[PDB]
Amino acid sequence: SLPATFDLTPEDAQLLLAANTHLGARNVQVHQEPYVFNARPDGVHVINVGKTWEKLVLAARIIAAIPNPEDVVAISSRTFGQRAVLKFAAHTGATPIAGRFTPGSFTNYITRSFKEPRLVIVTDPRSDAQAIKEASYVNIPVIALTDLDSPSEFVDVAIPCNNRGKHSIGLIWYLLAREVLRLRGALVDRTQPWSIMPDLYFYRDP
Template identity: 75%
Template sequence: STREKIVLAARIIAAIDNPADICVISARPYGQRAVLKFAHHTGAVAIAGRFTPGSFTNYITRSFKEPRLIIVTDPRTDAQAIREASYVNIPVIALCDTDSPTEYVDVAIPTNNKGRHSIGLVWWMLAREVLRLRGTIYNRETPWEVMTDLYFYRDPEAEAEDKVEDEKVVGAEEEAPEATNDEWAAAPAGFTGATGNWDGTTDEWGATNTAAPA
């Protein structure tokens, strides 16, 4: 099952002493945020986006790496990385769907590797299991302060629109109290007291008597 394969993959990852010897890869946009967060929490090296050919085989390139293990989001979109790993005997862990090629894949984690939520959730569960084996998290019952939403793909355009809307709401909330305060502050300034003689006779205040018609 998916959970059993996640535990198996986490044991392989935790067995590597230096976390920087692990390379996590995702050419698929839905998995790029997840691999970056996984690398941040576990200490691995992330390749989010296009994989530069020769990164594992051509030591002249600037992006040359010699990892002991690679983890890919999709064997189909990350085929170049898997092929180069097979040339230099690097073990491969992959998130595999029912139609994913499993050639040169050593550990396949069955999951939907095309949905933004499923990809993020599997990477989050894998990171939590690795931290549990390393002793950072006490056990599976202990809640992890990192939410699963942090691993989900987010559309940059949607984020920009939400940010603009939030700024508008905050600006409107800040302007409204200022106008109210100005109105209340201006009221006492415009008030003027009565200047007439309060001790005047009642004739001044009372109504005048008019003669009844004949």
């Protein structure tokens, strides 16, 4: 059970809605995501922010369940959420796999880039399909920040979120680094606001 304090408070709803994490893709939609709730008549689909937050801590609960807080890794092949992962890699341990992913880090034990994780997070499954595919041969759970137009194969934790937006990807990465620190107990009180801002996770145009 849960203490019921994990509801979507107005402040958490304010930053989620102002960051446009609810808008979806066009009429194209994969029937494996029943999380959709109506759509704009122009063609923009709408997702339920309640389910995104709900299944966020589910991803968080499985991320922090791993004892060692350094085996966790994240993939960001697309340059759009580049500096977001280093913030994850700087707050609660972990080793950055930011930028380019070496094809063989999972299987081959001779290459200098050989890690072994127990749980992986990715941003766009379409953009880094190599990461999930290669990881499938070493039987490791994965986490994906999918969108209603993205495939959801070989993934046991798929975060519904907007992939085309600075305000969305930076905020969702910031959140999933927040309660994991809270669940680990490094923030003590859950009601105390964090002193770090998602705009740090944001990527500057220059």
